[PDB]
Design a protein around this ligand. Structure first.
Ligand code: MG
Lengths: 419, 474
DNA sequence: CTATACAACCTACTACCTCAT
DNA sequence: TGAGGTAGTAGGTTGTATAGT
């Protein structure tokens, strides 16, 4: 007995249609044999088609595309229906599915040129109705439709190649955790030594004015050249708040809450960063929010670091990988690094107009892919590092903040095969 | 080395209750959730606007392919896709003429030029809708470029085109057009002459100004799926959503106009499982905060909103929902929530969830070009987690955020819940955007549309509109 | 009234993300 | 798809409190 609807098609040209027809058909009740569902591994594989065409194939559907007619495999596939067209001795055994807007008669195979036009050209839906309605006129067998079958296939077959797979993969963060924090955080009732009108960010250390007291990780002794007549402050006088407590929230002072304290460290950390880049070998791109730091041309041999290419060329403009430091306390204090692409026409002189930059950055960005963005950033952190395990951020002479160059790694079972 | 759990991708359910992951495929495969009697399409455009729109209706019947049809699925064509006809033969046209366009358009003010073409279209739409015996499912506003080009703030028509000097020394036309048409509910789908006819709009070089050969199949998916939704039926539903949840999305917009800069309109948008959505319009208060750079509500208005949502839900679903998540991008003041608590039935669980796309934990896959696939999440606390709604998607073999993806912090600011369900439900909620038909959106549909919604609140403020479904606010 | 010592905006500027899609 | 628009976020500019005449 014969029930099937064999679909002969060109791939990958008519794959979008062939896949649409079969699944739509399969869902509708029909039994469709198409190369699309299987993953054949046999010599018979041609045979399987022949056996299926020979015996169990109720209808031969052929994709009437220009490619389909000129295709060696399809033409071979076609050969049988004609061979088997007679045996059935049913006129309508072979059905050109004319899906192509542009078929010259000359292209069309003679056997099927003769045949009636199943027009998927004007609309795909009418063609399905027409293909089906033609099925009604001749009693082509069907099962009650279960679209469940339709997308079991789609979900299982078509989607087979790519889907979430239980695979293991680790991802490197851009949160590089702070390692060590000054043992205390102290506040100096600087008072007379303190002048409000002065700006400390030429004070070469992280300093900020809170209330009337003075805030930093530099011991009071730290500012001399730029803050005179302060050998007058008792060592005792300033508050000395346990840092190892603050993150905990162990410190809540009704006068100042930990949330207040938590915010405060951050201007320093960032400032601490801001200074260190003052003397860490990188010219800084300034964006209003904070600085972006990009190494100038030729600082690294042939403009590469640790095998990574942190400076390059686009068009007439050199691009320079750059980074920024957000510092965040929570959940785990870390230095957050967002990556940038600065732009210079010439190796060390920055481009004037962002619009050119914004265009540059988008244009340049397209080239870098997850793999590229990670390597350059890690290296850049790798680049800054003043030692094997970490960077050095200088609050004060005896007080330093150390942040791991290598960012946190997250390991997740569940990932996808790379295409 | 922290560890990432993975959230299985939610399945949205299409015709025959058969569910999958890509609406484009889900519709292409089986069709919409509720097949609908054919769309009757009214056009509110230049006589040219009709031909182009007709170019589209005619165009979309035939399949239209994207550049790569794995990353963007192809469009089989409307009838194959939605099992119904959006016929170009069947258009119900209310014309506009350059004379109308020129006369109104040219005014020196942008606003007097904007507000009036807006008025022009509505009368043309309104007259057709109210008056017609004949019925149109969607009114499509085909905006000549000349309207788009000049009907926005910050766009300066030369002093050498303006017929009348400004009478005296918001303004986005389309949003306004939706806003004015808001009081009498009609579905407005706004199209640009350029998008429909983009190869008929060459630049000086003679190449088209904006060239869509790559994504042409895509456009149809976005337009039709939106057109389908407005015209009646939802394309799809969330596949396995536990009964009786309420997702509520809090939307505000600052009203710049007020002398006191706290005058921001308020809304909440209610999503259950369909994403057809209901927009509860809140009235205007001192929501914006100078010190806090935040949006917030007084209890008495706050109580009305939850109630307005709860009651409408009940009128809708014959019971009070056993779980209500209120999403917003901000933390909740204890007083504001406590207003929420009081309105709520005793055994209903109310969760506040702050979905903040702050720039954290950009995660770079160690090996390969592609990024972390979407659904990976890192859970900070029982309360707080990071969700990747963006990132490589294998059905697509493409990344959804075209740069390395930025996960969204999710914190149950107020309320108690299982963070794993939260991440789940939010991953689910990116799947419900009828208007932009994509595999999933970055943001859950609760907060996805707020920025667009926010204009709409303010743009029309006299009105006290009833709670309404999205197609009205889209 | 009017000095300023401060508070809290408002403003670029940039990385994302959207739509008259 | 991409030329757009939005949304973070700092701050310096700015509009309000304090304070002393
Ligand atoms: Mg839209």
């Amino acid at each position: 007995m014969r029930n099937k609807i064999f679909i002969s098609h060109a791939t990958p040209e008519d794959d979008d249609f062939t896949r649409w027809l079969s699944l739509k058909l399969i869902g509708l009740g029909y039994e469709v044999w198409c190369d699309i569902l299987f993953l054949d591994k046999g010599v018979d594989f041609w045979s399987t088609i022949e056996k299926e065409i020979r015996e169990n194939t109720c209808k031969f559907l052929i994709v009437s595309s220009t490619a389909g007619n000129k295709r060696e495999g399809v033409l071979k596939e076609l050969a049988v229906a004609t061979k088997v067209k007679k045996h059935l001795q049913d006129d309508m055994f072979i059905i050109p599915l004319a899906i192509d807007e542009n078929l010259s008669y000359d292209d069309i195979n003679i056997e099927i040129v003769r045949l009636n036009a199943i027009d998927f050209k004007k609309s795909w839906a009418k063609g399905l109705q027409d293909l089906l309605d033609a099925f009604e006129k001749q009693n082509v067998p069907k099962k009650p439709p279960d679209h469940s079958k339709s997308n079991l296939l789609y979900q299982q077959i078509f989607l087979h190649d790519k889907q979430a797979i239980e695979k293991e993969e680790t991802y490197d963060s851009n949160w590089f955790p702070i390692i060590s924090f000054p043992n205390e955080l102290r506040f100096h009732r600087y008072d007379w030594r303190l002048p409000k009108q002065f700006d400390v960010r030429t004070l070469a250390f992280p300093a900020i004015r809170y209330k009337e007291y003075l805030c930093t990780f530099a011991w009071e002794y730290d500012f001399i050249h730029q803050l005179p007549k302060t050998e007058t402050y008792n060592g005792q006088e300033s508050i000395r708040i346990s840092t190892s407590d603050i993150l905990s929230g162990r410190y809540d002072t009704d006068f100042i809450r930990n949330y207040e304290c938590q915010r405060l460290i951050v201007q320093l950390i960032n400032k601490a960063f801001e200074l260190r880049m003052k003397d860490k070998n990188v010219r800084e791109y300034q964006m209003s929010k904070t600085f972006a730091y990009w190494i100038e041309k030729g600082k690294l041999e042939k403009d590469k670091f640790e095998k990574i290419k942190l400076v390059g060329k686009q068009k007439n403009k050199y691009w320079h990988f750059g980074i920024s430091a957000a510092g965040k306390l929570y959940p785990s204090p870390v230095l957050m690094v967002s990556s940038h692409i600065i732009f210079t026409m010439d190796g060390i002189n920055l481009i004037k107009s962002k619009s050119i930059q914004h265009s540059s950055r988008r244009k340049q960005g397209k080239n870098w892919w997850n793999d590229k963005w990670r390597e350059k950033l890690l290296a850049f952190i790798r680049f800054l590092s003043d030692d094997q395990n970490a960077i050095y951020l200088n609050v004060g002479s005896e007080e330093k903040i150390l942040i791991s160059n290598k960012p946190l790694k997250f390991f997740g079972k569940m990932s996808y095969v790379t295409p | 080395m922290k560890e990432l759990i993975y959230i299985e991708e939610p399945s949205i359910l299409f015709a025959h209750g058969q569910k999958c992951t890509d609406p484009r495929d889900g519709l292409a495969l089986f069709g919409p959730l509720n097949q609908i009697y054919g769309i009757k399409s009214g056009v509110v455009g230049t006589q040219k606007g009709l031909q182009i729109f007709k170019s589209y209706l005619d165009k979309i019947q035939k399949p239209i392919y994207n550049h790569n049809n794995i990353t963007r699925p192809m469009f089989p064509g409307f009838e194959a896709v939605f099992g119904c006809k959006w016929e170009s033969q069947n258009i119900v046209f209310k014309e506009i003429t350059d004379e109308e366009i020129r006369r109104y358009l040219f005014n020196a003010s942008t606003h007097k030029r904007t507000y009036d073409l807006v008025t022009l279209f509505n009368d043309k739409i309104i007259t057709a809708n109210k008056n017609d015996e004949e019925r149109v499912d969607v009114w499509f506003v085909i905006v000549p470029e000349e309207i788009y080009k000049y009907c926005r703030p910050n766009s300066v028509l030369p002093n050498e085109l303006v017929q009348t000097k400004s009478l005296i020394s918001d303004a986005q036309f389309h949003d306004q057009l939706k806003a004015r048409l808001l009081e009498h509910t009609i579905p407005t789908q706004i199209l640009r002459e350029s998008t429909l006819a983009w190869r008929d709009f060459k630049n000086t070089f003679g190449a088209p100004i904006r060239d869509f050969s790559k994504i042409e199949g895509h456009l149809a998916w976005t337009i039709s799926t939106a057109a389908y939704y407005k015209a009646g039926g939802k394309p799809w539903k969330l596949g396995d959503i536990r009964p009786g949840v309420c997702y509520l999305g809090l939307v505000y917009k600052k009203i710049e106009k007020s002398k006191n800069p706290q005058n921001a309109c308020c809304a909440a948008q209610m999503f259950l499982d369909n994403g057809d959505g209901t927009v509860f319009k809140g009235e205007v208060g001192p929501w914006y905060n100078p010190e806090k750079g935040e949006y917030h509500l007084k209890p008495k208005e706050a109580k009305a909103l939850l109630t307005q949502a709860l009651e409408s839900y009940k009128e809708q679903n014959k019971s009070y929902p056993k779980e209500v998540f209120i999403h917003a991008r901000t933390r909740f003041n204890d007083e504001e929530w406590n207003a929420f608590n009081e309105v709520t039935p005793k055994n209903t669980n109310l969760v506040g969830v702050t979905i903040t796309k702050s720039k954290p934990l950009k995660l770079y896959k160690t090996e390969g070009a592609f990024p972390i696939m979407r659904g990976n999440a890192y859970i900070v606390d029982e309360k707080k987690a990071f969700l990747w709604t963006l990132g490589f998607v294998p059905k697509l073999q493409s990344t959804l955020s075209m740069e390395v993806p930025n996960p969204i912090f999710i914190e149950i600011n107020k309320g108690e819940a299982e963070i794993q369900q939260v991440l789940k439900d939010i991953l689910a909620l990116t799947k419900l955007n009828y208007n932009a038909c994509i595999y999933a959106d970055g943001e859950p549909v609760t907060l996805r549309f707020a920025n667009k919604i926010g204009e709409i609140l303010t743009a029309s403020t006299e009105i006290k509109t009833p709670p309404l479904a999205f197609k009205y606010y889209i």
